Amino acid sequence: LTEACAAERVVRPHQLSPAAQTALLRRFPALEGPLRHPRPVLQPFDIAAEVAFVARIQIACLRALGHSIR
Amino acid sequence: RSTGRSALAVLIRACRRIQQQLQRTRRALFQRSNAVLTSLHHVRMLL
């Protein structure tokens, strides 16, 4: 996933080419998750994907707080 | 003949095996830095 995005200069592999997506999928089959899921609850291809998993819960409770206080 | 030429079979093979490693030092030293060329572009691929 590095060199298919480094030789193609694809900075983020959701901007990966459609043949360049599936040819990697023909090589390594566990990557159907981070490339072909509509709304994965964990963010695909980010460093803080576990951290952005947490900060939503911090957000979504405050609106559940803030619209309940009203 | 086994003194004059046999002082030269010493020194024909001597140069013709120094020159052969120099083909292999081109190849075994950038396929370690092409992985460096992979990772250094991968730092902005994180970004």
PDB file of C-alpha atoms in Angstrom:
ATOM      1  CA  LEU A   1       0.000   0.000   0.000  1.00  0.00           C
ATOM      2  CA  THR A   2       2.998   2.322   0.314  1.00  0.00           C
ATOM      3  CA  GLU A   3       4.682   1.709  -3.058  1.00  0.00           C
ATOM      4  CA  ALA A   4       1.401   1.430  -4.951  1.00  0.00           C
ATOM      5  CA  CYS A   5       0.698   4.879  -3.516  1.00  0.00           C
ATOM      6  CA  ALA A   6       4.324   6.091  -3.687  1.00  0.00           C
ATOM      7  CA  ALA A   7       5.127   5.162  -7.287  1.00  0.00           C
ATOM      8  CA  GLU A   8       1.667   6.440  -8.282  1.00  0.00           C
ATOM      9  CA  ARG A   9       2.167   9.449  -5.928  1.00  0.00           C
ATOM     10  CA  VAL A  10      -1.268   8.767  -4.427  1.00  0.00           C
ATOM     11  CA  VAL A  11      -1.128  10.783  -1.226  1.00  0.00           C
ATOM     12  CA  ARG A  12      -4.247   9.144   0.306  1.00  0.00           C
ATOM     13  CA  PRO A  13      -5.360   5.681  -0.897  1.00  0.00           C
ATOM     14  CA  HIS A  14      -8.996   6.684  -1.233  1.00  0.00           C
ATOM     15  CA  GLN A  15      -7.593   8.703  -4.143  1.00  0.00           C
ATOM     16  CA  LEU A  16      -6.102   5.432  -5.397  1.00  0.00           C
ATOM     17  CA  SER A  17      -6.905   4.484  -8.985  1.00  0.00           C
ATOM     18  CA  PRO A  18      -9.699   1.884  -9.456  1.00  0.00           C
ATOM     19  CA  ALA A  19      -7.424  -0.639 -11.154  1.00  0.00           C
ATOM     20  CA  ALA A  20      -4.731   0.282  -8.618  1.00  0.00           C
ATOM     21  CA  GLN A  21      -7.254  -0.455  -5.872  1.00  0.00           C
ATOM     22  CA  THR A  22      -8.403  -3.881  -7.037  1.00  0.00           C
ATOM     23  CA  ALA A  23      -4.983  -5.147  -8.188  1.00  0.00           C
ATOM     24  CA  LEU A  24      -3.846  -4.701  -4.589  1.00  0.00           C
ATOM     25  CA  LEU A  25      -7.075  -6.471  -3.618  1.00  0.00           C
ATOM     26  CA  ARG A  26      -6.071  -9.308  -5.956  1.00  0.00           C
ATOM     27  CA  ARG A  27      -2.785  -9.489  -4.047  1.00  0.00           C
ATOM     28  CA  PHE A  28      -3.773  -8.980  -0.384  1.00  0.00           C
ATOM     29  CA  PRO A  29      -7.430  -9.789   0.367  1.00  0.00           C
ATOM     30  CA  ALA A  30      -7.822  -8.366   3.901  1.00  0.00           C
ATOM     31  CA  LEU A  31      -7.929  -4.787   2.533  1.00  0.00           C
ATOM     32  CA  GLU A  32     -11.584  -4.938   1.421  1.00  0.00           C
ATOM     33  CA  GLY A  33     -12.397  -3.433   4.814  1.00  0.00           C
ATOM     34  CA  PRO A  34     -10.466  -0.136   4.609  1.00  0.00           C
ATOM     35  CA  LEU A  35     -11.275   0.363   0.900  1.00  0.00           C
ATOM     36  CA  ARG A  36     -14.824  -0.922   0.263  1.00  0.00           C
ATOM     37  CA  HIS A  37     -16.964  -0.227   3.308  1.00  0.00           C
ATOM     38  CA  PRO A  38     -19.708   2.470   3.143  1.00  0.00           C
ATOM     39  CA  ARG A  39     -19.411   3.855   6.694  1.00  0.00           C
ATOM     40  CA  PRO A  40     -16.825   1.925   8.712  1.00  0.00           C
ATOM     41  CA  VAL A  41     -17.069   2.805  12.387  1.00  0.00           C
ATOM     42  CA  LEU A  42     -13.269   3.060  12.368  1.00  0.00           C
ATOM     43  CA  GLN A  43     -11.849   5.529   9.876  1.00  0.00           C
ATOM     44  CA  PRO A  44      -9.903   3.956   6.991  1.00  0.00           C
ATOM     45  CA  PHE A  45      -6.276   5.024   6.422  1.00  0.00           C
ATOM     46  CA  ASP A  46      -5.620   7.589   9.166  1.00  0.00           C
ATOM     47  CA  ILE A  47      -3.134   7.749  12.036  1.00  0.00           C
ATOM     48  CA  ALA A  48      -5.646   9.029  14.601  1.00  0.00           C
ATOM     49  CA  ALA A  49      -8.350   6.621  13.370  1.00  0.00           C
ATOM     50  CA  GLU A  50      -8.607   5.246  16.908  1.00  0.00           C
ATOM     51  CA  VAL A  51      -8.441   8.787  18.295  1.00  0.00           C
ATOM     52  CA  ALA A  52     -11.139  10.034  15.897  1.00  0.00           C
ATOM     53  CA  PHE A  53     -13.137   6.996  17.035  1.00  0.00           C
ATOM     54  CA  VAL A  54     -13.069   8.467  20.554  1.00  0.00           C
ATOM     55  CA  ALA A  55     -13.716  12.152  19.758  1.00  0.00           C
ATOM     56  CA  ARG A  56     -17.056  11.382  18.059  1.00  0.00           C
ATOM     57  CA  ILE A  57     -18.288   9.806  21.299  1.00  0.00           C
ATOM     58  CA  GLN A  58     -17.109  12.952  23.067  1.00  0.00           C
ATOM     59  CA  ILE A  59     -19.126  14.966  20.541  1.00  0.00           C
ATOM     60  CA  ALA A  60     -22.235  12.778  20.281  1.00  0.00           C
ATOM     61  CA  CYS A  61     -22.844  12.720  24.035  1.00  0.00           C
ATOM     62  CA  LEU A  62     -22.555  16.510  24.355  1.00  0.00           C
ATOM     63  CA  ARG A  63     -25.320  17.026  21.820  1.00  0.00           C
ATOM     64  CA  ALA A  64     -27.260  14.340  23.686  1.00  0.00           C
ATOM     65  CA  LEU A  65     -26.507  16.477  26.726  1.00  0.00           C
ATOM     66  CA  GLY A  66     -26.997  19.850  25.064  1.00  0.00           C
ATOM     67  CA  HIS A  67     -30.317  19.167  23.397  1.00  0.00           C
ATOM     68  CA  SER A  68     -31.581  17.472  26.567  1.00  0.00           C
ATOM     69  CA  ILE A  69     -30.715  20.453  28.788  1.00  0.00           C
ATOM     70  CA  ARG A  70     -32.891  22.576  26.501  1.00  0.00           C
TER      71      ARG A  70
ATOM     72  CA  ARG B   1      56.518 -20.757 -20.779  1.00  0.00           C
ATOM     73  CA  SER B   2      55.359 -21.920 -17.342  1.00  0.00           C
ATOM     74  CA  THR B   3      57.239 -19.041 -15.694  1.00  0.00           C
ATOM     75  CA  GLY B   4      56.490 -16.118 -18.008  1.00  0.00           C
ATOM     76  CA  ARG B   5      52.832 -16.840 -18.740  1.00  0.00           C
ATOM     77  CA  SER B   6      52.324 -18.303 -15.254  1.00  0.00           C
ATOM     78  CA  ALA B   7      53.371 -14.987 -13.776  1.00  0.00           C
ATOM     79  CA  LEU B   8      50.509 -13.539 -15.842  1.00  0.00           C
ATOM     80  CA  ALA B   9      47.661 -15.963 -15.052  1.00  0.00           C
ATOM     81  CA  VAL B  10      48.270 -14.649 -11.540  1.00  0.00           C
ATOM     82  CA  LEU B  11      47.708 -11.127 -12.865  1.00  0.00           C
ATOM     83  CA  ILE B  12      44.991 -11.566 -15.508  1.00  0.00           C
ATOM     84  CA  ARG B  13      42.498 -13.086 -13.043  1.00  0.00           C
ATOM     85  CA  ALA B  14      43.472 -10.462 -10.437  1.00  0.00           C
ATOM     86  CA  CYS B  15      41.977  -7.535 -12.355  1.00  0.00           C
ATOM     87  CA  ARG B  16      39.080  -9.533 -13.820  1.00  0.00           C
ATOM     88  CA  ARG B  17      37.487 -10.231 -10.402  1.00  0.00           C
ATOM     89  CA  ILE B  18      37.907  -6.758  -8.938  1.00  0.00           C
ATOM     90  CA  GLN B  19      35.859  -5.469 -11.877  1.00  0.00           C
ATOM     91  CA  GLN B  20      33.106  -8.063 -11.393  1.00  0.00           C
ATOM     92  CA  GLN B  21      32.069  -7.055  -7.854  1.00  0.00           C
ATOM     93  CA  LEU B  22      31.593  -3.483  -9.081  1.00  0.00           C
ATOM     94  CA  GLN B  23      28.607  -4.730 -11.081  1.00  0.00           C
ATOM     95  CA  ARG B  24      27.141  -6.155  -7.862  1.00  0.00           C
ATOM     96  CA  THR B  25      27.778  -3.125  -5.636  1.00  0.00           C
ATOM     97  CA  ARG B  26      25.522  -1.059  -7.903  1.00  0.00           C
ATOM     98  CA  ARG B  27      22.654  -3.461  -7.294  1.00  0.00           C
ATOM     99  CA  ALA B  28      22.903  -4.367  -3.598  1.00  0.00           C
ATOM    100  CA  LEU B  29      23.100  -0.767  -2.323  1.00  0.00           C
ATOM    101  CA  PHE B  30      20.079   1.057  -3.767  1.00  0.00           C
ATOM    102  CA  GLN B  31      17.543  -1.698  -3.170  1.00  0.00           C
ATOM    103  CA  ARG B  32      18.130  -0.828   0.497  1.00  0.00           C
ATOM    104  CA  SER B  33      17.669   2.895  -0.230  1.00  0.00           C
ATOM    105  CA  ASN B  34      14.669   2.358  -2.491  1.00  0.00           C
ATOM    106  CA  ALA B  35      12.997   1.220   0.729  1.00  0.00           C
ATOM    107  CA  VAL B  36      14.289   4.523   2.099  1.00  0.00           C
ATOM    108  CA  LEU B  37      12.744   6.180  -0.974  1.00  0.00           C
ATOM    109  CA  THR B  38       9.535   4.328  -0.082  1.00  0.00           C
ATOM    110  CA  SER B  39       9.431   5.439   3.562  1.00  0.00           C
ATOM    111  CA  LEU B  40      10.513   9.063   3.004  1.00  0.00           C
ATOM    112  CA  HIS B  41       7.656   9.580   0.558  1.00  0.00           C
ATOM    113  CA  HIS B  42       5.482   7.593   2.976  1.00  0.00           C
ATOM    114  CA  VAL B  43       5.958  10.265   5.676  1.00  0.00           C
ATOM    115  CA  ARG B  44       3.912  12.710   3.610  1.00  0.00           C
ATOM    116  CA  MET B  45       1.644   9.772   2.713  1.00  0.00           C
ATOM    117  CA  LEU B  46       0.830   9.746   6.412  1.00  0.00           C
ATOM    118  CA  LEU B  47      -0.008  13.435   5.973  1.00  0.00           C
TER     119      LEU B  47
END
